[PDB]
Design a binder for this molecule. Structure first.
Ligand SMILES: C[C@H](CCC(=O)NCCC[N+](C)(C)CCCS(=O)(=O)[O-])[C@H]1CC[C@H]2[C@@H]3[C@H](O)C[C@@H]4C[C@H](O)CC[C@]4(C)[C@H]3C[C@H](O)[C@]12C
Ligand SMILES: C[C@@H]1C[C@H]2[C@@H]3CCC4=CC(=O)C=C[C@]4(C)[C@@]3(F)[C@@H](O)C[C@]2(C)[C@@]1(O)C(=O)CO
Lengths: 10, 237
């Protein structure tokens, strides 16, 4: 599951 | 403070490719590089969507994961419309795709359909307020087949943004609304072509095409889910 995308919204 | 003007402020300004326009593979390997940053900016745009933050973490991961190509494609249509009246593909102000690099191998194919989106903008004379409003929808137009982990929240937000296209169209109601929802529908149809072409270049490693870690992760996740076919686009027809 996509790492950067995640740390964006989190 | 007006929603439509607020949209006007958050809409991303266009990135440069910063490209050395002096090969069919660099050309693609550039666009992906660029694309990755665009997606960054589109995420910051996403966070700064009113009501977007209302939606639950996962759903946001998802809506973006699903519509990302769509939004990218749409906006490329807008640029190519406003900049050359439908004539070239304008990715960034430095990277204009004319009929000469269209004859670049591999490449004719995918680029016709990027110009065909723009063609839609030409035929319909879309204004800016309209564009912004629709794009918000594309973000909410591609969803899993098996529900959404905040389905009530969504349905509200989606409606908000339609009523909003209502206002935007009124500014320029109800014979025109049809046409544009037909376009909002046919995006999933035409983007689904690019997404394929995308996955090809991705997994067929022997084409030495590069995608930045940003794009890399999103695609490698999004790929299997899309391949089986767990995705239903919300249509108007
Ligand atoms: C687009 C149509 C027709 C009504 C309308 O109003 N269309 C514009 C006419 C012209 N104007 C825009 C200038 C309005 C002038 C009045 S003014 O206020 O400007 O004086 C709209 C107006 C109200 C809409 C329903 C409700 O929303 C709620 C609900 C949402 C669900 O998802 C689907 C079902 C439902 C029942 C909707 C269906 C459809 O979607 C309707 C009939
Ligand atoms: C044909 C597909 C569709 C292409 C994309 C079309 C939409 C787009 C708009 C831009 O302004 C920047 C990059 C992207 C997001 C894109 F242009 C590139 O990234 C390359 C791309 C994915 C593609 O060329 C590839 O899969 C090659 O890897």
């Amino acid at each position: 599951r996509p790492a950067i995308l995640y740390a964006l919204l989190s | 403070p007006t929603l439509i003007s607020l949209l006007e402020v958050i809409e991303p300004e266009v990135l440069y490719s910063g490209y050395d326009s002096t090969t069919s593979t660099r050309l693609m390997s550039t666009l992906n590089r660029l694309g990755g940053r665009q997606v960054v900016s589109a995420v910051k745009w996403a966070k700064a969507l009113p009501g977007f933050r209302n939606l639950h973490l996962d759903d946001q991961m998802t809506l973006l994961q699903y519509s990302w190509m769509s939004l990218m494609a749409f906006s490329l249509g807008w640029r190519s419309y406003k900049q050359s009246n439908g004539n070239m593909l304008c990715f960034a102000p430095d990277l204009v795709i004319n009929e000469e690099r269209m004859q670049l191998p591999y490449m004719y194919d995918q680029c016709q359909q990027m110009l065909k989106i723009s063609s839609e903008f030409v035929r319909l004379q879309v204004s800016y307020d309209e564009y912004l409003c629709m794009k918000v929808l594309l973000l909410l137009s591609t969803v899993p087949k098996d529900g959404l982990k905040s389905q009530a929240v969504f349905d509200e937000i989606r409606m908000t943004y339609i009523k909003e296209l209502g206002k935007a169209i009124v500014k320029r109601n109800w014979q025109r609304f049809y046409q544009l929802t037909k376009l909002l529908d046919s995006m999933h149809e035409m983007v689904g072509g690019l997404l394929q072409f995308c996955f090809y270049t991705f997994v067929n490693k022997s084409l030495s095409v590069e995608f930045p870690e940003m794009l890399a992760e999103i695609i490698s996740n999004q790929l299997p889910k899309f391949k089986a076919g767990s995705v239903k686009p919300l249509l108007f027809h």
